[PDB]
Amino acid sequence: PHRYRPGTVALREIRRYQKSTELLIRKLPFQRLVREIAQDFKTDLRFQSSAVMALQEACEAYLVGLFEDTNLCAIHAKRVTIMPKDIQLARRIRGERA
Template sequence: MWDVDREPDVSRSTGGKAPRKELASKAAKKAAPSTGGVKRPRVVALREIRRYQKSTELLIPKLPFRRLVREVAQDLKTGYKFQSAPIGALRKAVEHFLVALFEDTLLCAIHGKRVTIQQKDMQLACRLRGGHYLDLL
């Protein structure tokens, strides 16, 4: 459908409204690559749980933990120095303790017919473990 004087006419209609031109934002959305859809929070959380359960590395960062240990030691007595091996062992023990505490907390929440842990679950888990660190909560 080429005319000598005109550009090609793609859509010849027999009347009615002319087709609307797309806005620039709509055209940009169509041109952009698809991101794979909407991410559901539950699916992402389950994927993270699987990833962290498979991994064996410690999740507490080294330098912030080292600073925390130094700060606590400074409150007790000044002049302490720490080698990296004892701090690593302490970091491993703290992470193991916290994971076990959260496991017990989750069991307390499940016992209360809930899936979301609450502060009262952690308090109960601490009491069942002996309660000598209950004042930290």
């Protein structure tokens, strides 16, 4: 019964997604989220299809970024596994929270 050891697939998954540029969130669930969040600030709003994608682009990019910085915070603690406390540090230093 053939099995790849914990991590081997992860390392593959990385190479794979680093090499590509395609958006990694499913477009509708995101579009629905955007509109949900829009209703907070005004009701019955409409969105240019491009304005939705424009957001999704920024978000994914931003997060990937944060994870990059997060991963370093983790590693810096002799750890291979990112944890909330790692993100929390990154943002603190980035100057996103206090």
